[PDB]
């Protein structure tokens, strides 16, 4: 968080109270999932 | 089962062992053909 037009609220080494906070909502922790399909072309042994 | 093969099918090995069996049969099988005959007319027959 920067000031109104000052440098930065982490340079003056002076504490501030009313800066701005991000918030998310109910569910932002949905774990993710992927899936793969496998099929192989050449086996190890072969040929009649 | 005369020729092991890595597959579960009707692959060439079938044809091969089939050859082997009939070949070793014809190696054996010394037979002589003998037979009797009827005796028929030849003028009362269409085909010559």
TrEMBL record, chain A:
Domain of life according to the entry: Viruses
Protein name per the record: Major capsid protein
First and last residues shown, out of full length: 1155 to 1202 of 1202
